[PDB]
Every structure is written in structure tokens, then in C-alpha cells.
């Protein structure tokens, strides 16, 4: 019986460390990859938006 309790602590603490790591790392990987990716998407969209604004001004003159 008390071995059940020990097994529970063994899995919970192995899980705790796996989880402190997975909780943090899954977010740091997904989250930093996401902002890095979307920081670039945001910049590329802003660049394209500026280019289209310029393109629209050029057509207006045409």
C-alpha cells in the first residue's frame, strides 16, 4: 500500500520536473518561435503595406 503512495510521488515528481521543463519550454519554443516568426510577418506586412501605399500614390499620379 505505501508503495502506491511512493509510486505516486515518483511519477508526480518525475512529471513535475518533466512539466516544469515542458510547461516552460513548450511555451518558450512555441512562443518565441511565434513572435520571432510573426515579428517578421508583422514587419513584412508593414513593408508591403508601405509599398502598396506608394504604389497607390504612383497610380494616382498615372
Amino acid at each position: 500500500f505505501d508503495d502506491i503512495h511512493r509510486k505516486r510521488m515518483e511519477k508526480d515528481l518525475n512529471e513535475l520536473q518533466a512539466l516544469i521543463e515542458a510547461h516552460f519550454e513548450n511555451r518558450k519554443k512555441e512562443e518565441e518561435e511565434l513572435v520571432s516568426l510573426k515579428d517578421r510577418i508583422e514587419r513584412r506586412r508593414a513593408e508591403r503595406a508601405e509599398q502598396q501605399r506608394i504604389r497607390n500614390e504612383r497610380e494616382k499620379e498615372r
Binding site: F1, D2, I4, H5, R8
Partner: protein, 375 residues
């Protein structure tokens, strides 16, 4: 998905249903004990729409549904709705059809026999389960917590049972069953939030208050002192975000609701509270039993997860108990989730295989058999 005929295990309360399979140490899914039904006339054509929604469906579509709970004060009053809950609970999420697997359902020790008889009948005649067992919730809590001895407080949404068990034996003369529960605490909060200018009267509103309680409320180690400051200053207030972007700010009501557990008079209940209920069960047991029950106040069921409750219950019993004696509460983080886990433990014990009612004995005797076989 399963490679053995493991029993399926559910703890069906007046609040929520916890479910998973025998042999695990945790439920795999939780559903509210809710079946929802539309209260409006359809105008558009071809938008689907069910006659009723179950569990999480009932809450997700709740904007126009009235939401009913099939279980009240520990028993099933509406079993047609429980059949939909069980199909969803056992087959849609756990992916196991009971037809090929035994099922364990739970009850309080004094739970009306009619409820254990219907639980047995339904799983055998509607789900064709090969075997059944209806378990005592107190037994299950003690297994999960690693105890054979203690007072089990199953203080959930329906009823507080309060049963002493010693060396695996029931001590029924010392049971202090009390009609004081989490559903009443919610009703009280709805009324005191009404006093603050936020009336809640519809299903959507009722579900909001239950959400406010679960996220903001606590019992407090010392209620009257906590109230003296909370009722006097904004420094103990906490806000909650309502579904439409509006907010509610709550002060002493934050703990006055949970306090009804210790002061039942707040809801018109004739009771001195859950700590005297616990104490009297210890008091009524034999003198060489009492020492082990004072050292083992066991926490299961809902409300056991309010801040200050584990420390408050040990303090309140200590205050009633004789000096010299050590009063201890069994209240680990895995507190309350002990009843589902025990269902898994019991279902899978080798010493409990003979306790399963098979769908042999069941048809020869009928559902009244559960009263003769489960305990």
C-alpha cells in the same frame, strides 16, 4: 482502445461527473451533470439544433438553454438525462462502450436504495454492462488517501455525508448526514451579490455565480476577523469579469458565502456547521476509536478546495476536541479527487473481483440485487 475488460469508473454528483477507467490514478474527463434545453422558438431553418445538449455541450450552447441537473442531494431524480450523460461520459470521450466493460458508480453510505437500484438497472438494461458495482464514496476516499481509518467529509454540491470508518469498519451510529452543501452556498452568493447591485436570476446568471464562487471565494481561517476588514475596506475586494465585459467587485461576500459551511444559519439551515458535524462523528465512536479519528479528518468532494479550509477544519476540530490529543486533517493537494481515484482502486483490487454483480445474477434477481451484493 482498451486491451482488457477493465471496469469503467464514474463519480456522479449533483455538480459534476468525474470519469475514467479502473486501474488509473486520475479521471480522463470531467463533465458537468447538466442536460440543457432551448427555451426559444427557432426562426431560421437548417441550423441543426438538438432537443437537448449534454455536459459540456449544455454549457457551450447555454446562451438560450435552461440548464437542469439530473442529480440532487446525492441521488438521480432524472435518469433519462443520466443515460445521455453516461453515453457521452463513457463512449464519446473515454471511447469505451460499457457493453464490453464492467461499470462502477458511487453513492453516500445512507444514499436511498432507490438510487443504487436505478444506477444498477440503467447500466444493465440500457448499456448492457456485463457487470455492476455501486461503491461507497467514503471507502473510495480512504483508499485514495492511503487510510483505513478516518472521518470522511465528502462536502460537495449535493449533501455532506460525514461518516467515520475504523480499521475498514463502518461506524454508522456516528454518521452525521447533513443537508448543507455547495449548491446552497452558490444560492447564498447569488442573494448577497444581489444586495451589492448584481442580481442573478436566470441560468446563465446562475452559472456565472458558480464561476465567481469557484474562482474568488474562500472560507478564511478566521471569518469574523476577515469580515471585519473585508466589510470595512476595498483592500480585501476582488473583481471578476462577467461574460459581457462588465465586471463585479466582491468584498466580504467573497468569504461569507463559503462561511455558510461553518454558519449554516446564513441559508436558514438548522446546523452548527461542518466542523461540529465532523466532531460529533468522532465523539460518538468508541473511546479507542476516537484517537485515530481525531488524527484523521479526511477531505473529499467539493468545497474542500476553498482557501483556508484545510487549516480551518483542523483548527475548528482542535477547538472542540480535548487537549493533549493530536487533531490532524488529511488534506493533500490530491484532496477531494480521492473519491474518483478510490473508485479506480476498488474496481481493480484483486480482493474485489468477487464483489462485481454479473449480468447473470442481475437478470435472475432484478436491480434490487444491488442491495444484497454491493455491501
Amino acid at each position: 482502445d482498451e486491451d482488457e475488460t477493465t471496469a469503467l469508473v464514474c463519480d456522479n454528483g449533483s455538480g459534476l461527473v468525474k470519469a475514467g477507467f479502473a486501474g488509473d490514478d486520475a479521471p480522463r474527463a470531467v463533465f458537468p451533470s447538466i442536460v440543457g434545453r432551448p427555451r426559444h422558438q427557432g426562426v431560421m431553418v437548417g441550423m441543426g439544433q438538438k432537443d437537448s445538449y449534454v455536459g459540456d455541450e449544455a454549457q457551450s450552447k447555454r446562451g438560450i438553454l435552461t440548464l437542469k441537473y439530473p442529480i440532487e442531494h446525492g441521488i438521480i431524480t432524472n435518469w433519462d438525462d443520466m443515460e445521455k450523460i453516461w453515453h457521452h461520459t463513457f463512449y464519446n470521450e473515454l471511447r469505451v462502450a460499457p457493453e464490453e466493460h464492467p461499470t462502477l458508480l458511487t453513492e453516500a453510505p445512507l444514499n436511498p436504495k432507490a438510487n443504487r437500484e436505478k444506477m444498477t438497472q440503467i447500466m444493465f438494461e440500457t448499456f448492457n454492462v456485463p457487470a455492476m458495482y455501486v461503491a461507497i464514496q467514503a471507502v473510495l476516499s480512504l483508499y485514495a488517501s492511503g487510510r483505513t481509518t478516518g472521518i470522511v467529509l465528502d462536502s460537495g454540491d449535493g449533501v455532506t455525508h460525514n461518516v467515520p470508518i475504523y480499521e475498514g469498519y463502518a461506524l454508522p451510529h456516528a454518521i452525521m448526514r447533513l443537508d448543507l452543501a455547495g449548491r446552497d452556498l452558490t444560492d447564498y452568493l447569488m442573494k448577497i451579490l444581489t444586495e451589492r447591485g448584481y442580481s442573478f436570476v436566470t441560468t446563465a446568471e446562475r452559472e456565472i455565480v458558480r464561476d465567481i464562487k469557484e474562482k474568488l471565494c474562500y472560507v478564511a481561517l478566521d471569518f469574523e476577523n476577515e469580515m471585519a476588514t473585508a466589510a470595512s475596506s476595498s483592500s480585501l475586494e476582488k473583481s471578476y469579469e462577467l461574460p459581457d465585459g462588465q465586471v463585479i467587485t466582491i468584498g466580504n461576500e467573497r468569504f461569507r458565502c463559503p462561511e455558510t459551511l461553518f454558519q449554516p444559519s446564513f441559508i436558514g439551515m438548522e446546523s452548527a456547521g461542518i466542523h461540529e458535524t465532523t466532531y460529533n462523528s468522532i465523539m460518538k465512536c468508541d473511546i479507542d476509536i476516537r484517537k485515530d479519528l481525531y488524527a484523521n479528518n479526511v477531505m473529499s468532494g467539493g468545497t474542500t478546495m476553498y482557501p483556508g479550509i484545510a487549516d480551518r477544519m483542523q483548527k475548528e476540530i482542535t477547538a472542540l476536541a480535548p487537549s493533549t490529543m493530536k487533531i490532524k486533517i488529511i488534506a493533500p493537494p490530491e484532496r477531494k479527487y480521492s473519491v474518483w481515484i478510490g473508485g479506480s482502486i476498488l474496481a481493480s483490487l484483486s480482493t474485489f473481483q468477487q464483489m462485481w454483480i454479473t449480468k447473470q445474477e442481475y437478470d435472475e434477481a432484478g436491480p434490487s440485487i444491488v442491495h444484497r451484493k454491493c455491501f
